[PDB]
UniProtKB/Swiss-Prot annotation, chain A:
Homotrimer. This is Major capsid protein P3. It comes from the Viruses. It is found in: Virion. Major capsid protein self-assembles to form an icosahedral capsid with a pseudo T=25 symmetry, about 66 nm in diameter, and consisting of 240 capsid proteins trimers. The capsid encapsulates an inner membrane and the genomic dsDNA genome. The major coat protein P3 and two assembly factors (P10 and P17) are needed during the assembly of the virus particle inside the host cell, when the capsid protein multimers are capable of enclosing the host-derived membrane, containing the virus-encoded membrane-associated proteins. The chain holds residues 347 to 393 of 395 of the full protein. Signal peptide: none annotated.
From Swiss-Prot, chain B:
Minor capsid protein essential for stable capsid assembly of complete particles. One of its GO terms (biological process) is viral capsid assembly. It is found in: Virion. It comes from Enterobacteria phage PRD1 (Bacteriophage PRD1). Its main location: virion. This is Minor capsid protein P30. The lineage of its organism: Viruses, Varidnaviria, Bamfordvirae, Preplasmiviricota, Tectiliviricetes.
């Protein structure tokens, strides 16, 4: 309903404060997002 | 100031004063000063004169292409009511 949209890089972050960290720990992130590409209005065909 | 008669304040510091020195002289300074090292026209900085973008706008390029092609299915004929 209110997508994370920073206008500046990193204005917003996802946070995880771990209690225990094993060897080779990592966070695998997955994102769904919208972003603008471009449109024009022309075509032709004659036969 | 108060003066009190008959003990009056001396009418001056008088002539019994001890001239202690003739060291009164400041010798004028005479000097020639030259600050002449070769100057090179340039200074290096990390950045001068830039007005950096705080946010950019979104920007884009554009394309279209294709042709006009179609597969269609139509409504059947119907009895005409009036007219």
């Amino acid at each position: 309903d209110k997508p994370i949209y920073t206008l500046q890089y990193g204005n917003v972050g996802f946070v995880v404060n771990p209690k225990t960290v094993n060897q080779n720990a990592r966070l695998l992130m997955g994102y769904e997002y919208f972003t603008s590409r471009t449109e024009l209005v022309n075509a032709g065909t004659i036969s | 100031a108060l003066i009190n008669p008959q003990f009056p304040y001396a009418g001056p510091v008088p002539i019994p004063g001890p001239a202690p020195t003739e060291t009164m002289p400041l010798l004028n300074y005479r000097v020639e000063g030259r600050i002449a090292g070769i100057q090179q026209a340039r200074q290096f900085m990390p950045f001068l004169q830039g007005p950096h973008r705080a946010v950019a706008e979104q920007t884009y390029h554009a394309i279209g292409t294709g042709i006009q092609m179609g597969q269609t299915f139509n409504q059947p004929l119907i009895n005409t009511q009036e007219g």
